């Protein structure tokens, strides 16, 4: 699903947002533009407030008087936006006019009026958006007004930072934005003193948030370094975030109060307000908080430290203030001043500290302020209760609301994401979900308002407004998953088999109709978890917990494949398995088994809610004993029937059943089976649980799978654990390879192949195609049993050579003198006369021991000394030649095995050359 | 009733049968099959032993080693079958494997094992069934074995004819069929010597029957010509049937003994064993035999002569051997050898005769044999006691058992019949019954076993097994018939009125409850055997012998018709006859009398057991005196009442009674009653015992039954023996026939007809319709009294013709000259001129004597001589004509009676023609 949004109609910019309580129309302040949108975020109307030729430096703007300074077309930023329901209009205060305010008609955005003429009509030079805030308070006629705070930019004479102003009925009327009570001595406004400007050049008050409570007006503000941090002269500026308050009723402005505010987390300081939101707790939070229903609360967001208001730190914390607690702090402070203790301590306002005067008074919450001990500051900074802290991504904005008594908090992030937090200090827990309806790359603004119906939450970005629903639980398929996510909005509507909010679930109020906690689910179990393919229409019992009354009716659906009716008794559901006709359609090609998700389809909703792992196995498919028993499931093998089945009874008879893998029938391995070609030899075998062939059944045979020829030799089964193929000889054609492993299969009764787990094979091995010389044969492995036969002048097994004499010669254990050494080739063909060369000689029939070859090697006359490590017996000799200074130049290489006997010597085909 | 049977399940073949002592299950060896059947002969299980590819010539069969000779699918014949109870299995030794044996599980026929590998595992090449036999003997572990004899077929090196072999617990075990004690010098086996084979080529030992007795093992065998019959060189083979024995305990095989056996009947020799059966005598046979209870007996069957073992002779005899007698013969023989006298004399075994060595020894029955005077033969052939001989149909098999101490013997026949013989040498008698349960066309096999319960006897044929009950007495309706049949099983269960065995009769043990001999019956008599129909509820006394106590109550049932209660007194039963209302329902239409089978219906059983001939007569039905007295029964006739009755008193009065047939009243015959029509004549009659008519009774009349007219003439009874109808004339209309016999009935008092046994009739005779001439009338019988009357020119009785003159002419005795001869026709119309022809002249009124006709005949002029024999007076003349040479050619025939007077001559109507 996608979230409904409004792209910066002026793609160019965006600043403030507000919702009309009755209509749901959304008004959006922006630079050069003010838009009226539908609840859906469709564009209703666009107003052009923008680009005006102007100059910030000029006082009474160009229209009133001529300005020496040059003008340029500049952008008019919507500083503030406030809905005046009574007046049926919108106060949309801009800038770039010296801050002239505009009045737009509610429905059409028709400009009712925009008073420019008088000085009061000008609010502030300040170009920055959001640095201003305020509240509109109204009563019936002859009772009314507007409270607004703004930054000065060092304009102290021109504009007041905080003021109480008049809002006349007629937009045309001159009176607008006039101070409620103006006296030569005191006016309902607060200006910044010139002295304070000189001391600290830049001092300015930026107003972030503001709200009316009970009968007062509060502002969250940011100020400069004044005694904080201490500093003799100007240098760096750090800010202190404070709370301000006024009686609505005080024309005098005596009620002004100002406490610093912040909160700390494990020794980390969070001093700077990003945003705030006044709200209600609802029954849950209020109770543990210890509040009355009416009592208010203030969620806030603060960044770490005192540094860089322009660009704050990522570290940010969401804190909380109970209004009762702040009211107490203020009352506590006042009751103290009335004690006469200490000074007023408000640095920016009063440079010279005036003392507090003691007096008899009943100090109440109602206290509006008096002439003496006039505007005052505060010493003890008020600490707030921390809630959630984000280190990686800074929180920008916040909102909250009461839902079914649980308090949900919304928090914008620098990333363009919203967090949905259930505050559970008073309850018990944390953050439920996070969403990126907004804008994936870059942030969200403080103006974040819930709709009137409270279905959605409009989230504003620099670029776009996004209608983020306070829920999209539908994404969750199962009770287990729904309750699993934890985003507090979601619950499992049992009968509907869907995941949504309480309001959405019909009849959720009724018992067990709606599930909040996983325990309430859905958990399902089937008693016959595994059913064989062969079986049909088996009775199954279903155990389900945390489900609503099913009396509407339920069907069992194994999958999309089938569906069977069920009857309910007790706390169980009884359904039947599918027919054999139906079951195999599924099973085919899945083989061993197929796990299927058996679901329950409710009659009323018609959607599958609950599932379980259901296995269709089916033992019968197994072709062999090993697969049947040895496999992963409970299956029994019938030796006689030679079939695998679940039921013991189905087997031929009692003695026939195979429960254990050892009992199958399988062939055990013995030392490797060596088989010479052309020799008559028996092959004894060992095995286990070999069956005695029953009536109508034949005996055992050994089948050798040789590609050239497959041999069928009958065998005898001596007992349950031994077999033997009868005397026979085997061969393969080709003479290609010495050792050929061959798969062998033991069969009985013609087709029945006994299992061969090890997959034992028979090695058919075949005498010197390779070796013409006696030395080479005796050199070869003793395993081959191949040996040299003197009369033939050839080499073969004893079997192969006739014995006129008692002996054919085999190296008994190397104690066998032989013959005819030959040199195939040697490396380094050439060498230096000086010697030292390593000659590598490769031959066929050399000596078996190193000791004999040593002293044997000679290159011509030159003595050559062989290397032990380098020497590979009868194959190769590595030898190092000595000093060659002799006259020969080139000479043949000679090796004398033990002794230079005439039969015993070998000379190289090509000569070694000295250079 | 039909006998339960099992048809050759393989319709194809059958060989051996055995019964399990506990279960009663019947196992049946066959070619290619071994079956397990229920007691009822239902098929329990079938095993396929059959058709295997093999060849008899090959030694170790194909499985062990390759055979050059070609194989063919051949049938595997079950040579032997033996139940091994201890092992809970069945040893079913086949052939066609070189005789490998198989082990089948008792209950299911599961093949436990079949050892093929070793030489011992092969029994014999021999394909023939039944030529092998043996016994399984078992003891607890560490004591045990199998003794088996088989034919060799000239295989002497390969197999032993008789052996003592091992039967291990495990069928898988290799050890099976190994010799009990094998030594290089001597093994527990006996082989046939090669020398003996060369001398007689074919010599072979065939083992028919075998059994264990006491602590030995005996075999009945057939062998070849060795010194019998004498012969220098090979030629014909005849066999000698002998007995063999061994100690169970002799591993050495020293105990071997061999006596020839047979028996002779009136100079006829029976040398060849067909079958044998060891059994017990029971008290009856044993006593007269002179035996102890434990002592055994051996029934056997032998064919006549020494010839053709393959196909023996029909003549066969059932003989007997008492084991004590054979044991004596053996002991007698041994005690003799120990004397040192003579040689061992065993031709086939020892070619060169070794002498017997004398030694001191206590010669007992226990004697197992010693090293010296080692295996030995026997000189004196042991003769057996003959029992039954069948000339026409050869006995094949035998079995016997003890029943109530009487010894019943069973004998199969070539025909497929079983004989049930009580052996009564020790008792006194012969063969009781014969049955064809089996197979009507063709024979029964030696394996014939009684069931465990001994209710039935399974009789095996080549084709089928038949469950023949050792009794079907129910077929017999009466005590007389039951005991009459003689088949020893049957007895008369008196109270039940049924025929069955002793076991079947409830309370037969008690006195006179069961009848064995005819005397014990049932014999019944009724004192009033004959009762008249007229009588009612007559008292009858019943005499019955050989009947049980009737105090239960008895009813008398004449037939299905009625049943009357009876009371018992003394040794008699008193019942009443049926009422007149009841009796005639039966009698109607049976007439003279109805014999009825009066039965006795017992109260307890409710079945009629005893019967007698009971007559319902009834005299009253007889309508006449003759039927009443003259008939077959005692009935009296009342002349006056004219009714027949049993009681003398019922007659009118004393003088009226007719006891004798002569006295009845009947008409006696006199010379035939001749009655002329139209003549007034009296007819006197004679008769006997004619009644004098009593008051209210009229006199006698004669009634003639003439269809034309029936005449009623009154008559007078002169006395008891004479009657006479009054002067009257009779006639019948038609003139069709001369002599008409007529039935006459003599009646008195209107309706009463007197009896006419002779059935005397009156002959009404009537004058020449036929004869126009005087000669013809006088020619006719003198009886007719018909005569010629001159004046009328016609012929009638004197009565019929008026006498003007004193005479009408009648041939007084042929002395009466007459007239007018006529010739109707003559045969041979034509004749030869030469003459010699026999002329046959037929006329009406010729001469009475031959003498006058001779010389009378002439054909024209030609003289013709008449033949005397040929001549029938006045009807026909046969005459031979003389030489015709005269001129006439054709001429008329003339006859002159005496003289050729003008009145007296006749001439032929047509002339005789000469050609």
From Swiss-Prot, chains A, B:
Belongs to the plexin family. Residues 472-522, 618-665, 766-819 form the PSI domain. Residues 1-915 are extracellular. Expressed in the developing nervous system. Widely expressed in both the central and peripheral nervous systems. Expressed in the peripheral ganglia, somatosensory, olfactory, visual, auditory and equilibrium systems. This is Plexin-A4. It comes from Mus musculus. Coreceptor for SEMA3A. Necessary for signaling by class 3 semaphorins and subsequent remodeling of the cytoskeleton. Plays a role in axon guidance in the developing nervous system. Class 3 semaphorins bind to a complex composed of a neuropilin and a plexin. The plexin modulates the affinity of the complex for specific semaphorins, and its cytoplasmic domain is required for the activation of down-stream signaling events in the cytoplasm. It is found in: Cell membrane. Disruption phenotype: No visible phenotype. Mice exhibit defasciculation of the facial branchiomotor nerve and of the ophthalmic branch of the trigeminus, with variable severity. In mice lacking both Plxna3 and Plxna4, migrating neurons do not show the normal response to Sema3A and Sema3F and do not migrate away from these semaphorins (in vitro). Interacts with NRP1 and NRP2.
């Amino acid at each position: 699903p996608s979230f409904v949004t409004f792209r910066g109609e002026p793609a160019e910019g965006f600043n403030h947002l507000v919702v009309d309580e009755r209509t749901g129309h959304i008004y959006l302040g922006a630079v050069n533009r003010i838009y009226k949108l539908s609840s859906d975020l469709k564009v209703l109307v666009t107003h052009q407030t923008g680009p005006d030729e102007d100059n910030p430096k000029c006082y009474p703007p160009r229209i009133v008087q001529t300005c020496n300074e040059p003008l340029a077309s500049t952008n008019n930023v919507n500083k503030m936006l406030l809905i005046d329901y009574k007046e049926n209009r919108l106060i949309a205060c801009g800038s770039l006019y010296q801050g002239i305010c505009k009045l737009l008609r509610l429905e059409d955005l028709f400009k009712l009026g925009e008073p420019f003429h008088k000085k009061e009509h000008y609010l502030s030079g300040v170009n920055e958006s959001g640095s201003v805030f305020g509240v509109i308070v109204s009563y019936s006629n002859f009772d009314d007004k507007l409270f607004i705070a703004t930054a000065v930019d060092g304009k102290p004479e021109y504009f007041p930072t905080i003021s109480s102003r008049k809002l006349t009925k007629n937009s045309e009327a001159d009176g607008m934005f006039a101070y409620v009570f103006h006296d030569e001595f005191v006016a309902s406004m607060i200006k910044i003193p010139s002295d304070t400007f000189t001391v600290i050049p830049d001092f300015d008050i930026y107003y972030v948030y503001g709200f009316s409570s009970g009968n007062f007006v509060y502002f969250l503000t940011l100020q400069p370094e004044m005694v904080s941090p201490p500093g003799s002269t100007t240098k760096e500026q750090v800010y202190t975030s404070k709370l301000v308050r006024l009686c609505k009723e005080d024309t005098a402005f005596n009620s002004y109060v100002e406490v610093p505010i912040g909160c700390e987390r494990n020794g980390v300081e969070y001093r700077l307000l990003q945003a705030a939101y006044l709200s209600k707790a609802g029954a849950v939070l209020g109770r543990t908080l210890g509040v009355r229903p009416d009592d208010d609360l203030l969620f806030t967001v603060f960044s770490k430290g005192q540094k860089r208001k322009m660009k704050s730190l990522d570290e940010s914390a969401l804190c909380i203030f109970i209004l009762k607690q702040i009211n107490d702090r203020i009352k506590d402070r006042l009751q103290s001043c009335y004690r006469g203790e200490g000074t007023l301590d408000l640095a920016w306002l009063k440079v010279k500290d005036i003392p507090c005067s003691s007096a008899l008074l009943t100090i109440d919450d109602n206290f509006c302020g008096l002439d003496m001990n006039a505007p005052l500051g505060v010493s003890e900074m008020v600490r707030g209760i921390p809630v959630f802290t984000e280190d990686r991504d800074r929180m920008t904005s916040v909102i909250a609301y009461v839902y079914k008594n649980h308090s949900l908090a919304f928090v914008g992030t620098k990333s363009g994401k919203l967090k949905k937090i259930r505050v559970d200090g008073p309850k018990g827990n944390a953050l439920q979900y996070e969403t990126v309806q907004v804008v994936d790359s870059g942030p969200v603004l403080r103006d974040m308002a819930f709709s009137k119906d409270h279905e959605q939450l409009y989230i504003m970005s620099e670029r776009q407004l996004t209608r983020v629903p306070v829920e999209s639980c539908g994404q969750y398929r199962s009770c287990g998953e729904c309750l699993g996510s934890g985003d507090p909005h979601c619950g499992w509507c049992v009968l509907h088999n869907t995941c949504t909010r309480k309001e959405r679930c019909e009849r959720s109020r009724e018992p067990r109709r709606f599930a909040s906690e996983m325990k309430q689910c859905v958990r399902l179990t089937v008693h016959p978890n595994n059913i064989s393919v062969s079986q049909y229409n088996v009775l199954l019992v279903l155990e389900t917990y945390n489900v609503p009354e099913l009396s509407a009716g339920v069907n069992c659906t194994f999958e999309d494949l089938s569906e069977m009716d069920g009857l309910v008794i007790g706390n169980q559901i009884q359904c039947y398995s599918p027919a054999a006709k139906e079951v195999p359609r599924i099973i085919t090609e899945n083989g061993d088994h197929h796990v299927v998700q058996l679901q329950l389809k409710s009659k009323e909703t018609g959607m599958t809610f609950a599932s379980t792992s259901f296995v269709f196995y089916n033992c019968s498919v197994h072709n062999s004993c090993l697969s049947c028993v040895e496999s992963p499931y409970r299956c029994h093998w019938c030796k006689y029937r030679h079939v695998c089945t679940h039921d013991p009874n189905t087997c031929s008879f009692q003695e026939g059943r195979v429960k254990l893998p050892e009992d199958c029938p399988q062939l055990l391995r013995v030392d490797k089976i060596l088989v010479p070609v052309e020799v008559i030899k028996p092959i004894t075998l060992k095995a286990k649980n070999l069956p005695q062939p029953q009536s109508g059944q034949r005996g055992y045979e050994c089948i050798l799978n040789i590609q050239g020829i497959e041999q069928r030799v009958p065998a005898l089964r001596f007992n349950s654990s031994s077999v033997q193929c009868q005397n026979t000889s085997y061969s393969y054609e080709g003479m290609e390879i010495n050792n050929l492993p061959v798969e062998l299969t033991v069969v009985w009764n013609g087709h029945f192949n006994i299992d061969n787990p090890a997959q034992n094979k028979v090695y058919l091995y075949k005498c010197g195609a390779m070796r013409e010389s006696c030395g080479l044969c005796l050199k070869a492995d003793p395993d081959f049993e191949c040996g040299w036969c003197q009369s033939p002048g050839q080499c073969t097994l004893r079997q192969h050579c006739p014995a006129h004499e008692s002996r054919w010669l085999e190296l008994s254990g190397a104690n066998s003198k032989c013959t005819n050494p030959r040199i195939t080739e040697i490396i380094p063909v050439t060498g230096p006369r000086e010697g030292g060369t390593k000659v590598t000689i490769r031959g066929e029939n050399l000596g078996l021991e190193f000791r004999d070859i040593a002293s044997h090697v000679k290159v011509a006359g030159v003595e050559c000394s062989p290397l032990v490590d380098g020497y590979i017996p009868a194959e190769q000799i590595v030898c190092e030649m000595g000093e060659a200074k002799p006259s020969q130049h080139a000479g043949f290489v000679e090796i004398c095995v033990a002794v230079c006997r005439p039969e015993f010597m070998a000379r190289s085909s090509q000569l070694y050359y000295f250079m």
